[PDB]
Every structure is written in structure tokens, then in C-alpha cells.
Design a protein around this ligand. Structure first.
Ligand SMILES: *[C@@H]1O[C@H](CO)[C@@H](O[C@@H]2O[C@H](CO)[C@@H](O[C@@H]3O[C@H](CO[C@H]4O[C@H](CO)[C@@H](O)[C@H](O)[C@@H]4O)[C@@H](O)[C@H](O[C@H]4O[C@H](CO)[C@@H](O)[C@H](O)[C@@H]4O)[C@@H]3O)[C@H](O)[C@H]2NC(C)=O)[C@H](O)[C@H]1NC(C)=O
Ligand SMILES: *[C@@H]1O[C@H](CO)[C@@H](O[C@@H]2O[C@H](CO)[C@@H](O[C@@H]3O[C@H](CO[C@H]4O[C@H](CO)[C@@H](O)[C@H](O)[C@@H]4O)[C@@H](O)[C@H](O[C@H]4O[C@H](CO)[C@@H](O)[C@H](O)[C@@H]4O)[C@@H]3O)[C@H](O)[C@H]2NC(C)=O)[C@H](O)[C@H]1NC(C)=O
Ligand SMILES: *[C@@H]1O[C@H](CO)[C@@H](O[C@@H]2O[C@H](CO)[C@@H](O[C@@H]3O[C@H](CO[C@H]4O[C@H](CO)[C@@H](O)[C@H](O)[C@@H]4O)[C@@H](O)[C@H](O[C@H]4O[C@H](CO)[C@@H](O)[C@H](O)[C@@H]4O)[C@@H]3O)[C@H](O)[C@H]2NC(C)=O)[C@H](O)[C@H]1NC(C)=O
Ligand SMILES: *[C@@H]1O[C@H](CO)[C@@H](O[C@@H]2O[C@H](CO)[C@@H](O[C@@H]3O[C@H](CO[C@H]4O[C@H](CO)[C@@H](O)[C@H](O)[C@@H]4O)[C@@H](O)[C@H](O[C@H]4O[C@H](CO)[C@@H](O)[C@H](O)[C@@H]4O)[C@@H]3O)[C@H](O)[C@H]2NC(C)=O)[C@H](O)[C@H]1NC(C)=O
Ligand code: NA
Ligand code: NA
Ligand code: NA
Ligand code: NA
Lengths: 674, 674
């Protein structure tokens, strides 16, 4: 519930930014943004931009025309990408906030909804003056991607009937009036959307924050954008790539573990993919593409793409087999520091992997092609109209099990390369004159909580209604969550030093009930937190609350609540400092009444600062150390018995109901955690 | 039956070497090796070794621990390889025989049986002072890999009953007392181990000497060992590789021919392998992995390895398509001399293919991966416990038909490259003023013979029994064999010269009854012999006895007989000079009563000496000429009608029984050859 103060100039500018997220699916002919848009003469505005070549480029594509309103926009299709990147460059190179805003009002009014939102979200995140301003949560901007079609439909019907037929009847269908607004209860999906064991974890993969999280990841550093803005970070880009996915997959594999699901399965482009998924969405023209269980990847429609994909991976194998090779106009050694970066950019086909300021249409991307084949859609009708899968959007990608299958496949390939890195030696890890004597944690408890957000942006309003910037329509759904807990660390030091304290969470046992060995477990640990303590000689005890963990955040406030906070000169400080991290809700994987066993790994090493990175991301240790150190590479497990290391077995309990559905039953009062 | 004299210092040193092969599966707490081992302080012995880095390396791995006793050891698994190579380096760098021996007694006592044997066999072969000493035959050191499980079991039972229930009853089960020792008759395998036509040739592929032969090949020059020891041989290593397999496959294809079996079949990693095999073995934990007929190679478990294997071969295709290319930090032309070497090292993934003194864990090997996929086992439990196939050991590899399928696939690939070599011209092959006028051979007759060896090393003895170094337990099995024959060569020379005389054996007809043409037959010929004659002008006749053929040897003597020979200051001179060649038994493929037709090819060319190679192997012609010249590459068959060449059609007859089983029937006296 934490805030940050803000003056009137901010408030007024902020409000201007947010005003464009109102009733995104329509136009209020009475809005201020509409007057600005009408007043804006795009052909006479060359002087609004600091880059005339970008403006000229836009005006050219614009003279021929863009993606029409009402078609689905996706970053994964070439022409739409060029157009969206072009729009973004105008947003970005606008000289001023006033020029930025006029341009944004223009695009808001005259361009495809999805395109505009896409570029506007990114621009705000990216523009120097505009960063430090808050954005509505991805699910409040794009409800259509965060709301399964049962509810979305009920919403259509409720709006068409301007309320309920008879209030008791739609109490039974989970629809409520609460404070002049509607609330629809929403369950997670059937086996008619997840038609296999994967359904056990719908509550994770359909989770709105998880999905938001991935969308924020993309938006902070789009594959198509070079690193110029982040200077010295350019060097660490590929390294992020690995860390982001490795880390995400670890979090995901933990959920599997507590639902008895075991290892994410391998697959092949020459065989059928066992595990299907039926996205519960529809676009303007099309229901989303369904991928049934045992879907044949290898058919006529996909042959040429499979040829592409196969060689793409096999050339990585050739790079591993040589060790030094000239590739992409560089001479690159895989014992080199620069290697980690290369690898990452190679798999993502970055703008950085090439010359490029902005990615050339013609540089074929393994991720792009992978998502087309796994999405299982029919081939696009023309280049403005394609049949959407979940893999077509960062908002929806984490929903399809095939997503984790793809990125696990990538991560394994990079781990294959990671054999070329030099495993940390003993004195390397050994912190001289520093020992952790004990670690102690509070009770770790997961549980479920209803959570609300306003889905009004996917609901339609009348000419009259739009004047009021109407937003009646809320989705209440049980989401994972845990109680706050503290870790206390007992330390003995010879000397006063400065130390970094990192603590990770990972698995304890196989699916066979065997202890994981570190040589096989290191990729399965995810970072919870890091910080810097001045450490005194003698015995000390460091306490750390789950509330202060570096890698997690509070939920976003609805746009309504943001405005209510501006009215009293404030902003939600997590939405401010760190919108791009995992929600704290999802910090722990769902536990059991037993207590599910995991290891908390605590690690203390010497703090040796470097000049602050200017960061596209999660502020990471002001260190020359890698991301996710010391788990950034294969280990020699002997070297992990150091006195400044501590593995502590920890059990995650659960409380109240065991399944989200038990919360959305009309007339049943659930067991709520206390 | 030929020997070599030896003094008392040799005898005493020899005996010390052999003492460690007694009751390998246990420890005699009363043995001398046990006292030496107890007395040996490994941590205080840094001064026993000429390479302190190797000692430090060992002591490090040793401080963390090795493969425990009773697990199966295999060179094909990473950690076990590192440990075994480390042990070997200690054996190798021991400064002295006394240091070598103390170290060997230590490992004998405290380390895994298989590991120790592996490294000790190799060390002895490799150490300067210790070469020129004799080693027990691989099948007497590792009976477990040379004895099918019917017999192995009967042996267990016989030891448990301390003899036979009733002597007549186990005469019926083929068990005999002969001179206070046991003899078990052993048949070759059913179709419940070879479940297809491949069974026709079990008598070849289960043959103990053939298998020994391959094990000796490995042990003389391990893939993981650089060539430093053999100096200028380093240059010819890849060339051996081809010659060894090409040659072996020729010998194998001849057996096929006389059993009406035809060409070794091709296969694909994307398809099922037709031809299964059920290894008749079990380890401590596991029965060996079975590969049924029509086993699907392409499944989830094997996908990622298939990706590896496929690109591994396809990059060889790219090297063929370019002709000059930078690869492995060399610039390599396939018209170059160095090419043949490269090719070989590429397919075997040698230590030489890289920088390496000793092979790095992380350099993935096509042979290693091939054997895992074709072995069809479940994936290893942890890295000290895997489920063995026949392809896991050089002792057992030649038993699995898939072995010949793999290496034929390799050999074909190199033959594909061999198009880049320049075919021998006419004057190149033409020996001026030298003509073979006639060739004449004695009758070539194969037949079967019982053969004995002591399998005691896979049988367990009591605390008391071990004191006597007990060895009761023998396996008598019919093995292929031929009668000695002589070739006489009629020569006419203008001049006195020195000539090399080479003679090869190969096929006459297709499976279709058509004469093979040389363009297609050259890879199917195997070298029988080469030598150097001073040739006088005028007419001469050279005789050569099958007994003196350069490429074949007498059987090994049992360890008992070795000791009985030392007692009178001698050693078996074949076990001395040439333990690493094919047994003479297997010189000819099994004939028929008809006479089976083959060609003997006789070739005489000018002897032009070069400084003697210091040889890891079969002393080959002291020539600048290739291995297996003039059949080292594709031919132009015109150029093979020279006067110093002679192709002679030759028929191999058989005598006595036609099948080995007819020899192991109780109360049936077989037709024995005379
Ligand atoms: C039933 O299905 C049919 C076929 O799919 C649809 O017919 C298409 O209708 C769309 C309009 O919705 C057409 O696309 C638009 O029409 C014009 C095309 O002009 C043609 O002729 C000019 C020369 O005058 C050429 O330059 C051009 O190549 C075309 O061949 C354009 O005027 C339109 O441009 C407008 O919209 C764009 C964005 O789309 C803006 O950028 C512009 O400013 C402008 O406002 C647009 O291109 C399309 O041509 C039709 N297809 C075919 C094959 O004829 C029906 O719409 C559909 N019916 C229903 C009820 O869905
Ligand atoms: C999220 O998903 C969950 C899980 O599927 C849904 O929960 C189901 O919800 C429905 C309500 O929508 C439940 O159905 C109701 O069952 C009640 C309990 O009945 C018991 O006793 C009756 C006799 O009263 C027996 O017949 C029955 O076998 C049980 O023993 C009933 O009292 C309800 O009565 C209704 O019946 C008829 C329809 O046949 C109506 O016309 C009546 O007017 C009356 O409303 C009703 O049938 C069901 O139990 C729940 N399932 C589970 C597994 O718990 C949530 O609804 C869903 N939430 C959202 C928002 O989708
Ligand atoms: C039933 O199946 C179970 C599970 O597979 C088997 O249990 C395993 O038993 C083996 C022993 O046979 C265990 O391995 C050994 O145990 C010790 C492991 O110590 C643990 O704790 C220390 C800290 O004290 C850690 O360092 C370490 O990571 C371990 O977690 C070691 O002391 C042993 O070392 C000894 O042998 C090695 C070679 O193995 C020598 O090099 C050493 O000098 C020393 O003598 C060894 O590592 C194994 O831990 C057990 N597995 C599990 C999962 O617990 C049962 O044996 C089996 N029962 C039967 C009848 O087969
Ligand atoms: C290597 O593999 C070969 C080939 O399989 C084995 O050879 C077989 O060996 C068994 C002996 O172990 C043979 O079985 C014996 O057959 C004899 C010949 O019998 C003929 O006459 C009898 C009447 O006397 C007829 O019934 C029969 O049809 C034949 O016409 C019998 O005299 C033997 O008598 C035994 O029978 C019973 C079991 O039913 C016992 O209880 C008796 O006490 C008595 O011993 C016996 O049945 C068989 O012929 C061989 N097969 C072949 C193809 O030749 C080798 O044994 C094997 N060697 C090893 C070491 O494994
Ligand atoms: Na499509
Ligand atoms: Na999955
Ligand atoms: Na295995
Ligand atoms: Na075969």
C-alpha cells in the first residue's frame, strides 16, 4: 500500500498520459484527445521531431496507409512490425512532451487500436521525460487478452441488457452489482481449453500478473530495438535473455513440482507435439487457432519453416563444435567474455546481433518462426489479417504450454554452450573471514485471494456514455498469494566489510523422491532477493522481510485508484520504481497442507562496486558479477560447501481452499486463510 | 607354440605385473599387493611422480571421491572418464617401476575394479619400461564380458555346490572335471539374443579373440590420449582409424558372404533400426539393455542426441562441398596430404583433433553419442550408474550388429571424401622390370576347434580359498580356425632390387553371382601380409607360409601357462612382440564343402625405406606408402592390370562339422578335421 509524492505539474501531465487508455476500443467525439487530434496537422509537423528521417519514413508509409482499425495487430508479422516501429520512432523522437502528446492523440484517433497501444506503451517506457510516469496495468489496457471468453461474453450480455434480467438469477451466474459497478467472478479454464494434465496449473499460466510480467519484459527491451539507449548495457543484453527465461522456467518448474507434474517435455520439428491447447479467445474475424493434442508439426504448411528452424539450431551446434569462428562480421570465441552476450542475441535474433539500429524485415528470426509453427494457425490471409494464437502476443504467450516448451529448448541450448565457461573455483567463491552460522525462516504459506480489475476496455459504450469515460465492468478472480515472512541470517565475521547478500529458492527432490544434486539443480533455482549490508566484525544477525525482496512487487492499482491518488498528489511507488518485476503474489509456488519441501539458498560475498548501470530493467547488483550469480553457469558442487553459503530446507504450506474454483461458487462461503 | 628367453629380473618383475590380475573381483587380505597398498601413503607420495600437476589433479578428485566399487565402469561416460584418465596419468608418470607398482597395488585395493583394470592395462601397454612385458588376455582379465550368461550362471551354481550334484547329470549339462579343474562347454547364442539372420554369424561376433582384438586396438591408442608418445606417428593417426575399421569391416563382410547374408544395411536417425540384439549380460544392478528389432531411434529420449549426430555428419558434407575451409584452428585442404589425418581424427573426435594433451569433458563426440542411441538403454540414473549395452565396452562392442552398422556408416563417409584423392597412375603402380608370372596356393581349409580359457575372475572364492590364488573354472568353446597353407609366387626380374611383397584377400562375386569390379571392390579386401625380399635378376620363386603372415598371431596362453613358462625363463613371443593383431584362427572366413570362391591379390613394388616409425601398432611397411596400399583409396581399374600384380581365384573349403554346436553335445563324438 506504499506511495510517493508528486506535484501538480506531474499530476496534470500524468493525467494526460492516462487519458488515452479510456475506452480504447472506441472514440469519444467529445474528448480532449479528439480535439488535439483534429487540430494536429501531421503533414505540417516535420518540426515536432528531432529526427527528420524517421518522420519522413512515417509520412511515407502513411501516404500508402497502415493497418486498418479492427484488425488484430501483432509484432510478429512483418509489415505491421515496420509500421509499429515507425509509429514508435515518431513517439520517441518527438522533441517535447507537447509534441509527443499531440502525436499520441493523433494515433489514438486515426490508427489501429492495437498498434497504437503497443507503441504508446513502449514510447512512454522508453522516452527520457516520460519514464518515471506510471502506466495502467497491461490487463486493464488489454482486457481482451486477460479475460477468458466465458466472462468476456457474460460482459457483452450484461452491457446489452444494461444490467441483469433478474438480480438473483445472475447472482447464480456469478454476476454482482457492487457500488454501482458490475463484478463478474471468473474461474480458470476447463480441460476444454487445457485438454491434458497441464490444466492442473491454469491458475499460474492464466494469471494476469504473470502475463503482464512477460509483456513488461518485452516492452522494456523489444527484440527489434537496439541497445543504444542503455549504453554499456548493450554488452550485457544476451546475458539478460538467458537470465530472464532460465529464471522464469525455474519458477514454472516449481509449480509443476507441487502439482505432481514433473519435467517440461522435449519435442521435435519432425514429430507430433503431444500437448495441445485451445486458446479461449477470439479476434474481430477469427476464433483463435486451436492446437489439439498430438498435433503434427511436420506437414506441408510447415515444411519450409521447419527447414529454417532446424538449421538455425544446428548451426548453433556447429558454433559449439568449432570454438572460434567468424560469424556476423565478428570473430568470436566462446571462452571470451563477449560470448554470453553473443549466444543470447543469436537465439533472440536481436537488432544487436546485426548492424541494426532497428531490425530489418528480411532477417529471419527463430522465435518468430517457432511461434508460427507451434501456434498451429492456418497461414495468414493477407499481411494485415492473420489467425491469432496465444503465441502471437506477449500478453498471452505464457498461457500456452508450448511457450515453456520452446524457451526451455532455447535455454537448454545455451546451457549446452555453458560447458565452454570456466566453473567457479574454490577461493573464487570463498569469502575470507565470513561464515553463515545459521539461517532461520518464518512460516512460508501460500493461499488464494480474490483480485479485481476493470475490464471496461473490452466492453462497448453509447455515444452518450462515452462522455463520462465509463468504466463499470470488473473481473474478480482468485489469484495465488502468500503471507509475508522473514528470513533471519546468523553471521560471524573477522572484519568489517561490505557484503552482498543473495538468497535463491529452488527444488529439494526429484519426482522420484531423490535429493537433486547441484550439478543438475543449478538452473532450477530462482533469485528471490539481493542486497548490500555493512557487516561488522563479530557475530551479527541480518533480518530480511519478504516485503523488501528485490525481485518482487505489489499489485498494480487500477487506473481509478491511480487517479484518486493523484487527486491528493501521490503515485503508487511500485508502479513508479519497478513495474517490470514479478508480482509478489507469485513469489512462492502453491504449497500443500503437508508443507512442500524446497531449498532456500543464502549466499554472502564481498561487495565490490562498479559505476552504476543505466538500466532497462530490474536494478541488479552494482557488480561486475553476472546476472544470477553464482548460479549463472554449471557448478562443481564441492566448491559449493563454503562457510558463506547456506542451503536450508524449507516447507511451503497452504491455507484455506486448495483450488481457486471453490471461491466462485454462488452461496458457498470458502475457507479463507487468516 | 613359439617362445623368447628372459632373465630372472624380468621374471620377478613380470610376476609382479601379473599378480594383480588374480581374483580381480575381490581382495586377498593375505596378498603381497595388499601389504604394499596398506603401506602406501598416497598423500605423502607426491615424490613418486614425474608430473606434479597430474598427481595434484588425482589427489583433488580423490579428496572428493571416485566411482565406488561394484558399479560398472565405462570409458564412455564423462566423470568416469576423467577419473580413469587421472588414475592412468598417475600410473604413467610414476618415476620408477617400484612407484608404478605401489600405485597399482593401491588402486587394485581401493578403487573400482573396472576402472583400475582399464587404466592398468593401458598403463602397462603405454609405459616405456613396462612395454615389452606380457599381459593376460582380455578375456581372462574380464571373463564377465566374454562369457554368455548361460555359462556364467552354470559357473555360479557349480561354485555354490562346490562341484556337481551328481557327476553324470552335469556331464549332461556340459560340465566336466578335468585335472582338478572345471570345464564348461559353451555354445554361441540363440535367436533369443540374435533375433534375426544375424545369428548365422554369432561364432564370429561373439568370438573371444575378435573382441579382444578390438579391446587391444582401443588400449594401444585411446581416443582420449594425444599422440605425443609416438611423435611422427601423430601425422598418421587418422589414417590408422580408417585402415582399422575398413579392414575389420572387410573381414566381417567376408563372413556375411559365406553365410549368404549380403551387404551390411544402411540406417537413419529419423527411422527405426531393423536389426535388434539382446546382449546376454548383466551388471551388478542391471541386466544389459535390449534393442528389439525395429527399434525406433527417433523418440523423445533420443531427440536432442539425434540433432547432434545429424549435424555432425552434415558438417562433414559441408567440408566436402567447400574444399578448403578453416576448421579447428587450421586451414585445411582436402587435396593436401594432412587431409587423410584430419578426416580420421574428425570422425573419432580424437584428443589430436583439438589442442588437447588429454580430451576435455566438454568436446562432444559423435562415436560416444552414436553408441548411446544405438545401445537403446534407458538414460543413466546418475553419473556413476548407467544401464550397460554391448556398445558400452570395447570388450563387447563387436557383438552388436549395430556396431558394424555404425562404423560402416563412418567408413562410407570417409570414402566419400576419398574422391578428393588422386587415383594412382599407371607408372605409379608399374614396377619396372618385374613381373609375377604365377601364383600358387596350398589348400585353404577352415574348421572348428575347442578352445579353453580360465574364467575364474568372474567367480567368487572364500576368505580361505583366495589365499591360494584359486583359478579352477574354464570355458571350452569351438572357435573358427584354418590349416596352415603356403603361397608360392613365381617372379621374373631384369635386375637385382629390393621389393615389398604384399598380399590381400577379398571377395570374388556379388550376392548375385556377378564378378565384383575393382572400382567397387577395393574396400572389401583385407591385408593378409607384407614383407621385404631381396630379388635377384632372372626367375625366382618366393614361398610364404600362412604361419609367417605379418597381420596375424597365435592364440594367447592362459596366465597359468605364462607362469609355467617363466619358471623356465621364457615368454610366449606373440604375446610379447604383437598382442594387438588379429588371431590367426580368424584369418579365413568360414568356408564350405564346395570351396567358397575369393580372390587373393598379390602385389610386388619397389622397397624404398624411411626412418623407422616408433609404432603404437602393427609394424607396417617401413615406407612412405599409406596403410593398406595400394587399396588405400579408389582405383582406376585399368591401372590394376600391371605385371607385378596378380589376382588369383582361390576357394576356401571347410572340414569336420559345419556348426559349432555339434561339438558341445554330450555323448556325441563330432567329425573333427584331420
Ligand atoms: C467482404 O469481403 C471483401 C473481400 O475481402 C471485402 O472487400 C474489401 O473491402 C475492403 C474495404 O473494407 C477493401 O480495402 C479498401 O478498399 C479500397 C481499395 O481500393 C482499390 O482500388 C484502388 C484504386 O482506387 C487501389 O489503390 C487499391 O489497390 C485497391 O484495389 C481502399 O480505398 C481502402 O483504403 C482505405 O482504408 C485504408 C486502410 O484499409 C486507409 O489506409 C485509407 O485511407 C482508406 O481509407 C482499403 O484499401 C478491399 O479492397 C476489398 N477487397 C477486395 C478483394 O476487393 C469486404 O469489405 C467484405 N465485406 C464485409 C461486409 O466484410
Ligand atoms: C466456478 O466453477 C465452479 C466449479 O465448477 C462452479 O461451481 C458449481 O456451481 C454450480 C452453481 O453455478 C453448482 O450448482 C448448484 O449446486 C447446488 C448444490 O446442490 C446439492 O444439493 C442438490 C439439491 O439442492 C443436489 O441436487 C445436488 O446433487 C447437490 O447435492 C444446488 O443447490 C444448485 O441448485 C440449482 O439447480 C438448478 C439447476 O439444475 C437451478 O435451476 C436452481 O434454480 C438452483 O440454482 C446448483 O445446481 C455446483 O455445485 C458447483 N460445482 C462444484 C464442483 O462445486 C462455479 O459456479 C463457477 N463460478 C463461476 C463464476 O463460473
Ligand atoms: C537403496 O537406495 C538408496 C538410494 O539410492 C541408497 O542410498 C544411497 O546410499 C549410498 C551408500 O551406498 C549413499 O552414497 C554414500 O553415502 C554418503 C553420502 O553422504 C551424504 O551426506 C554428506 C554429508 O555428510 C554429503 O557430502 C553427500 O553429498 C551425501 O548427501 C557418503 O558418505 C558415501 O561416501 C563413501 O563412498 C564413496 C564412494 O561412494 C567414497 O568415495 C567415500 O570415501 C565414502 O566411503 C557415499 O557418497 C547415497 O548417499 C544414498 N543415496 C541417497 C539418495 O540417500 C541405498 O544404498 C540403497 N540400499 C541398498 C540395500 O542398496
Ligand atoms: C549346445 O547346443 C546343442 C544344440 O542345441 C545342444 O545339443 C542338444 O543337447 C541335448 C542334450 O543336452 C540333446 O538332447 C538329448 O537327445 C538325445 C538323442 O535322442 C534321440 O533319441 C531319443 C530316444 O533316446 C528320442 O526321444 C529323440 O527324439 C532323439 O531321436 C537323448 O538321448 C537325450 O536323452 C535325455 O532325455 C531326457 C530329457 O527329456 C533326460 O531326462 C534323460 O535323462 C536323457 O539325458 C537328450 O534328450 C539334443 O539332441 C541336442 N540338440 C541338437 C540339435 O543336436 C548341446 O547340448 C549344447 N551344449 C551345451 C554345453 O549347452
Ligand atoms: Na494466420
Ligand atoms: Na509445458
Ligand atoms: Na544408462
Ligand atoms: Na550388422
Amino acid at each position: 500500500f506504499k506511495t510517493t509524492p508528486v506535484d501538480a505539474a506531474f499530476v496534470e501531465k500524468q493525467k494526460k498520459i492516462l487519458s488515452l487508455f479510456y475506452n480504447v476500443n472506441e472514440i469519444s467525439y467529445e474528448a480532449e484527445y479528439y480535439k488535439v487530434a483534429q487540430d494536429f496537422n501531421i503533414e505540417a509537423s516535420k518540426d515536432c521531431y528531432t529526427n527528420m528521417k524517421a518522420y519522413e519514413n512515417f509520412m511515407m508509409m502513411y501516404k500508402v496507409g497502415f493497418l486498418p482499425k479492427n484488425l488484430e495487430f501483432s509484432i510478429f508479422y512483418e509489415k505491421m512490425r515496420e509500421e509499429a516501429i515507425a509509429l514508435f520512432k515518431l513517439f520517441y523522437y518527438a522533441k517535447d512532451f507537447e509534441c509527443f502528446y499531440k502525436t499520441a492523440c493523433y494515433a489514438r484517433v486515426y490508427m489501429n487500436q492495437g498498434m497504437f497501444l503497443y507503441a504508446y506503451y513502449i514510447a512512454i517506457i522508453q522516452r527520457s521525460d516520460t519514464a518515471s510516469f506510471v502506466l495502467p496495468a497491461p490487463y486493464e489496457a488489454y482486457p481482451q487478452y486477460f479475460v477468458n471468453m466465458e466472462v468476456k461474453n457474460k460482459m457483452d450480455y450484461v452491457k446489452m441488457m444494461d444490467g441483469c434480467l433478474d438480480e438473483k438469477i445472475c447472482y447464480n451466474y456469478g454476476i454482482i452489482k457492487e457500488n454501482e459497478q458490475f463484478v463478474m467472478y471468473a474461474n480458470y479454464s476447463n480441460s476444454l481449453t487445457y485438454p491434458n494434465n497441464e490444466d492442473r496449473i491454469a491458475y499460474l499460466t492464466e494469471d494476469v500478473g504473470l502475463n503482464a510480467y512477460y509483456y513488461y519484459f518485452h516492452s522494456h527491451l523489444p527484440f527489434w530495438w537496439n541497445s543504444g539507449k542503455y549504453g554499456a548495457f548493450k554488452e550485457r543484453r544476451g546475458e539478460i535473455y538467458f537470465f530472464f527465461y532460465q529464471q522464469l522456467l525455474a519458477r514454472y518448474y516449481m509449480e509443476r513440482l507441487t502439482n505432481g507434474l514433473g519435467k517440461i517435455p522435449e519435442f521435435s520439428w519432425y514429430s507430433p507435439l503431444r500437448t495441445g491447447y485451445l486458446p479461449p479467445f477470439n479476434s474481430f474475424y477469427y476464433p483463435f487457432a486451436q492446437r489439439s493434442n498430438d498435433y503434427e508439426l511436420h506437414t506441408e504448411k510447415n515444411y519450409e519453416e521447419i527447414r529454417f528452424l532446424d538449421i538455425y539450431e544446428k548451426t548453433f551446434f556447429q558454433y559449439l563444435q568449432q570454438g572460434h569462428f567468424k560469424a556476423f562480421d565478428k570473430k568470436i570465441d566462446l571462452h571470451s567474455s563477449k560470448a554470453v552476450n553473443f549466444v543470447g542475441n543469436y537465439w533472440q535474433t536481436n537488432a544487436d546481433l546485426f548492424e541494426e539500429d532497428f531490425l530489418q524485415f528480411y532477417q529471419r528470426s527463430y522465435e518468430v518462426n517457432a511461434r508460427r509453427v507451434l501456434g498451429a494457425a492456418p497461414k495468414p490471409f493477407n499481411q494485415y489479417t492473420f489467425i491469432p494464437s496465444a503465441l502471437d502476443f506477449y500478453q498471452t504467450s505464457a498461457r500456452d504450454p508450448a511457450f515453456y516448451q520452446l524457451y526451455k529448448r532455447i535455454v537448454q541450448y545455451i546451457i549446452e554452450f555453458k560447458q565452454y565457461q570456466v566453473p567457479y573455483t574454490q577461493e573464487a567463491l570463498h569469502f575470507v573471514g565470513l561464515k553463515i552460522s545459521d539461517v532461520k525462516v518464518d512460516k512460508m504459506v501460500t493461499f488464494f485471494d480474490h483480485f479485481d480489475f476493470d475490464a471496461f476496455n473490452t466492453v462497448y459504450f453509447s455515444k452518450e456514455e462515452l462522455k463520462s469515460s465509463p468504466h463499470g465492468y470488473k473481473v474478480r478472480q482468485p489469484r495465488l498469494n502468500h503471507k509475508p515472512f522473514t528470513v533471519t541470517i546468523d553471521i560471524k565475521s573477522d572484519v568489517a566489510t561490505n557484503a552482498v547478500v543473495k538468497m535463491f529458492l529452488g527444488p529439494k527432490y526429484d519426482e522420484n523422491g531423490f535429493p537433486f544434486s547441484l550439478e543438475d539443480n543449478w538452473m532450477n533455482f530462482y533469485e528471490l532477493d539481493w542486497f548490500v549490508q555493512k557487516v561488522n566484525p563479530g557475530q551479527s544477525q541480518i533480518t530480511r522481510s519478504s516485503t523488501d525482496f528485490a525481485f518482487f512487487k505489489e499489485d498494480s492499482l487500477p487506473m481509478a485508484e491511480i487517479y484518486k491518488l493523484l487527486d491528493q498528489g501521490k503515485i503508487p511507488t511500485d508502479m513508479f520504481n519497478s513495474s517490470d518485476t514479478m508480482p509478489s503474489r507469485l513469489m512462492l509456488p502453491k504449497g500443500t497442507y503437508d508443507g512442500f519441501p524446497f531449498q532456500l539458498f543464502v549466499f554472502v560475498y564481498p561487495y565490490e562496486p562498479t559505476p552504476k548501470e543505466s538500466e532497462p530493467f530490474k536494478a541488479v547488483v552494482p557488480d561486475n558479477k553476472p546476472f544470477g550469480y553464482p548460479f549463472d553457469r554449471p557448478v562443481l558442487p564441492q566448491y559449493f560447501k563454503q562457510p558463506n553459503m547456506f542451503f536450508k530446507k524449507v516447507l511451503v504450506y497452504h491455507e484455506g481452499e486448495l483450488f481457486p474454483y471453490l471461491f466462485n461458487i454462488p452461496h458457498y462461503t470458502p475457507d479463507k486463510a487468516q
